[PDB]
Amino acid sequence: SGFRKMAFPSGKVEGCMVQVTCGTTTLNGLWLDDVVYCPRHVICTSEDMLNPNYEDLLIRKSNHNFLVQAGNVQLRVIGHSMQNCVLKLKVDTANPKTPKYKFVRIQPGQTFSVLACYNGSPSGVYQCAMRPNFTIKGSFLNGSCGSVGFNIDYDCVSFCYMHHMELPTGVHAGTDLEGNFYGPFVDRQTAQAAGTDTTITVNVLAWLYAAVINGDRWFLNRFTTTLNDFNLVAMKYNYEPLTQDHVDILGPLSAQTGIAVLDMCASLKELLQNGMNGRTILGSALLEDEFTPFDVVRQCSG
Amino acid sequence: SGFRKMAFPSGKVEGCMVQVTCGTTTLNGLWLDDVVYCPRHVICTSEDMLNPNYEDLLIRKSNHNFLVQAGNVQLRVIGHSMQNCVLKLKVDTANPKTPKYKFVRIQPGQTFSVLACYNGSPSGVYQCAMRPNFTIKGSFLNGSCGSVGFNIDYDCVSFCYMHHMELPTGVHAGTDLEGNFYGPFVDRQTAQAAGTDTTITVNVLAWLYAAVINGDRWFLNRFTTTLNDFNLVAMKYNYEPLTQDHVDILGPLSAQTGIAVLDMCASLKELLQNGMNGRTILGSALLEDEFTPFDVVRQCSG
Ligand SMILES: *[C@@](O)(C(=O)NCc1ccccc1)[C@H](C[C@@H]1CCCNC1=O)NC(=O)[C@H](Cc1ccc(F)cc1)NC(=O)c1cc2ccccc2o1
Ligand SMILES: *[C@@](O)(C(=O)NCc1ccccc1)[C@H](C[C@@H]1CCCNC1=O)NC(=O)[C@H](Cc1ccc(F)cc1)NC(=O)c1cc2ccccc2o1
């Protein structure tokens, strides 16, 4: 029993964190086989960030301008290239701790673990979701750039996020491991801001099923809803539209609990309309949306 | 910016998890140097649990009754002994991945990371606190016994919890790594239950300071309180008494924010008396008590 915001064990990713220095800028990199991946703004001064031309800035660098440190060992850079907003430093040593791994670009609403790191040294691990507005509500300080987000499946690490910057509302933006930003963001100082966000409906419904699995039913009711009428209420509360695909994905949890998906939707509609009236669900007084249907199945009893 | 329920990176503990089997009972063990630590009820059948005499049960076992598996390698047991409620199996191989480590018995209100494991295989990592009633609100299924809780300090792992059982309210009980239960619990099937719990006041106050550090001040007020009058209100709301030691411990956060501890107490008193009125703090609609003052300092900007 019990339900916690669980991250994946971080050891396979710990063995890949290094530190990268260019000039006076130091950040983290990800060392897989003989390549080190890090944010390309490692080559930037602070004045460069106003309007940088990274091709121009990078053509002025050589291999020896990059200092890569893995624990107490310096790693020699023997090539460098840029791919979108990530720099790839080829080093002369393949990481002996490289896990089986993939690079994946995730969809909004998907969750992943973040291994927060400073100076190539992991400091903590936590779970978060890619918001519908393509930010994440992380916990990141100065020096955390190059920290990565990942999922683990049967010993294969799927890396999905590398950290680049903090937006003015305190939420975070970054790229996939091929350097493409999530959302409209760019790596130059501009007036860019997080767009309006929405709640991830299919995740809220998964977490209500987690609550039932863990023995809590107080929020259920005898009603059902059509998908259309549910979405009318969802739109009103800044929830994402629920699709038939979402309903299909919630199939397995529905079957385990005996609660039809559209019946759980009628429950959520009632919770949105009346609030919780001083009650909690799984120890929360807010409707939680950072658990996917897959997360619930993985963590909960069958 | 940002504030997350952060666990320690789990890699150093991942390298220590093994599986232990006795008869038809399999659970997890902790392999450090040439010793494997696991719950002593690994030697029990289900009928043994009604009134077990573990000395009697253990005297009937030999080394070869214990099967220890580390990854794909069987580990040969060459001695066994019991220390309180933990069994110590001496194996013929020292774990080459043993971290620098300590065993610590923690106080209620302290937090730690849990590495949930099944069949010697880590499945997830999360943060929790030892409640005042000496339970933890974990996330544990069948097979999770022997999973451990830990803190990490400068590469030294301080193990503080090994998981033994789930109580009827769905909260969890276990021991330190020397086999002594937290709380009044025992490893035999009885009508034991979690006692009444309280909220960890010094932790709530730490988290209010985290909120201020992260730029949220809406709950502050111009008032102060005496420690005595605060504790009168705390007692009324099932909060733990706040001590002068707690106030001293909150010193550094007080100094960083410029908010005297007793002024933050007046803020908490106002929050307890009026509620939040639909507002949130650090993304929570409840007052959070699973962050110690040390956790806040570690995670937050200075
Ligand atoms: C990274 O660790 C990092 O890259 N530091 C090195 C660096 C900084 C500036 C120029 C070159 C190299 C930073 C992590 C941030 C730090 C703040 C707290 N939380 C974090 O996640 N990332 C940064 O410092 C970026 C650099 C950047 C600037 C512009 C851009 F388009 C892309 C990247 N800056 C910010 O994240 C940030 C937040 C903020 C608030 C107010 C004013 C400026 C500002 O920058
Ligand atoms: C462990 O993984 C474990 O040790 N399994 C092996 C085992 C079970 C029974 C007898 C001998 C060996 C279990 C983890 C629990 C499992 C349930 C879900 N969440 C968990 O954390 N621990 C157990 O199964 C204990 C065994 C035990 C029994 C009595 C005792 F005093 C101490 C330990 N049992 C329970 O945790 C538990 C919960 C529960 C509810 C209702 C009826 C019985 C019952 O037992």
Q: Which residue has the tokens 């399999």?
A: B26
**Residue of B8, B10, B117, B207 to mutate when probing chain A, most A C-beta within 10 A:** B10
* Alpha-carbon dihedral angle through residues B129, B141, A203, A102, given to the nearest 10 degrees: 100
CA distance B8 to A10: 9
CA distance B251 to B258: 10
For residue A251, give both structure tokens: 């199939």
Distance B178 CA to ligand 2 centre (A): 20
How is chain B split into domains, by residue range?
1-14+100-197, 15-99, 198-301
* Ligand 2, atom 22, residue with closest C-alpha: B165
**Most informative mutation of A140, A145, A148 for ligand 1 (most atoms within 8 A of CB):** A145
From residue B151, alpha-carbon distances to A19, A172, A191, B154 in Å are: 24, 27, 41, 10
Cβ of A147 closer than 6 Å to ligand 1, yes or no, is: no
Instruction: Give the class (CATH, top level) of B198-301.
Output: mainly alpha
| Any A CB within 8 A of B121 CB | no
Judge: A6–B172 Cβ closer than 8 Å, yes or no.
no
Length of chain B (residues): 302
DSSP class of A7 = B
Kindly list the catalytic residues of B.
Answer: 41, 145
Q: How far apart are the first and last CA of chain A?
A: 11
B6 → closest Cβ in A126, A166, A215: A126
**How far off is chain A from B55, nearest CA to CA, in Å?**
31
Domain B1-14+100-197 and domain B198-301, same fold? Reply is no
B10 → closest Cβ in A125, A138, A285: A125
CB contacts under 8 A, B 91-120 vs A, are: 115-116
Q: Which residue has the tokens 């909960």?
A: A300
DSSP class of B292 = -
For residue B201, give both structure tokens: 């006041």
Distance B166 CA to ligand 2 centre (A): 6
SS3 B126: strand
From residue B49, alpha-carbon distances to A23, A85, B63, B163, B263 in Å are: 65, 59, 22, 16, 51
SS3 B130: coil
Method for structure elucidation = X-ray
CB < 8 Å to B214, chain A: 170
Distance A166 CA to ligand 1 centre (A): 6
CA distance A102 to A114: 16
**How far off is chain B from A243, nearest CA to CA, in Å?**
27
Beta-strand (E) ranges in B40-171?
Answer: 66-70, 73-75, 77-83, 86-91, 100-103, 111-118, 121-129, 148-153, 156-166
A244 exposure class (CB count in 10 Å sphere: 0-12, 13-18, 19+): exposed
Q: How many CB atoms lie within 10 A of CB A101?
A: 20
SS3 B56: helix
| Any A CB within 8 A of B9 CB | yes
Pairing of strands A156-166, A148-153: antiparallel
B139 → closest Cβ in A3, A139, A166: A3
State the CATH architecture for B1-14+100-197.
Beta Barrel (2.40)
Catalytic residue among A16, A85, A145, A300: A145
Name residue B127's amino acid: Q
For residue B98, give both structure tokens: 């043993």
| Any A CB within 8 A of B285 CB | yes
CA distance B56 to B41: 13
CB contacts under 8 A, B 13-32 vs A, are: 14-15
CA distance B78 to B64: 8
* Closest residue by Cα to residue B294 from B106, B132, B141, B138: B106
Judge: B139–A4 Cβ closer than 8 Å, yes or no.
yes
CA distance B173 to B41: 14
CA distance B293 to B111: 10
Catalytic residue among A41, A80, A164, A246: A41
| Any B CB within 8 A of A277 CB | no
Judge: A139–B3 Cβ closer than 8 Å, yes or no.
yes
Closest CA in chain B for residue A143: B301
After which residues does chain A break, using C–N > 2.5 Å?
Answer: none
Question: Could you tell me the CATH superfamily of domain B15-99?
Answer: Trypsin-like serine proteases (2.40.10.10)
For residue A153, give both structure tokens: 């499946």
8 Å CB contact between B242 and B234: yes
B11 → closest Cβ in A15, A166, A301: A15
For residue B279, give both structure tokens: 């507002």
User: Containing H/E element for A273?
Assistant: helix A261-274
| Any B CB within 8 A of A1 CB | yes
The alpha carbons of chain B give a radius of gyration, in whole angstroms, of 22
Instruction: Locate the ligand 1 atom nearest the alpha carbon of residue A144 and give its number.
Output: 2
8 Å CB contact between B120 and B18: yes
Distance A165 CA to ligand 1 centre (A): 5
A265 is catalytic: no
CA distance A183 to A210: 30
The alpha carbons of chain A give a radius of gyration, in whole angstroms, of 22
CA distance A226 to A6: 33
Length of chain A (residues): 302
Strand partners, A82: A87
**What sign results for the dihedral spanned by CA atoms A170, A175, A176, A182?**
positive
8 Å CB contact between B146 and B27: yes
CA distance B300 to A139: 8
* Ligand 1, atom 44, residue with closest C-alpha: A166
* Ligand 1, atom 3, residue with closest C-alpha: A145
Q: What is the DSSP string of B21-50?
A: EETTEEEEEEEETTEEEEEGGGG--SGGGS
**Angular region, A170: left φ>0, alpha ψ -120 to 50, beta rest:** left
| Any A CB within 8 A of B168 CB | no
Distance A160 CA to ligand 1 centre (A): 20
Helix segments in A81-214, DSSP class H:
201-213
**How far off is chain A from B167, nearest CA to CA, in Å?**
10
Cβ of A27 closer than 6 Å to ligand 1, yes or no, is: yes
What is the CB < 6 Å shell around ligand 2?
A 1; B 25, 27, 41, 44, 46, 49, 140-145, 164-166, 172, 187-189
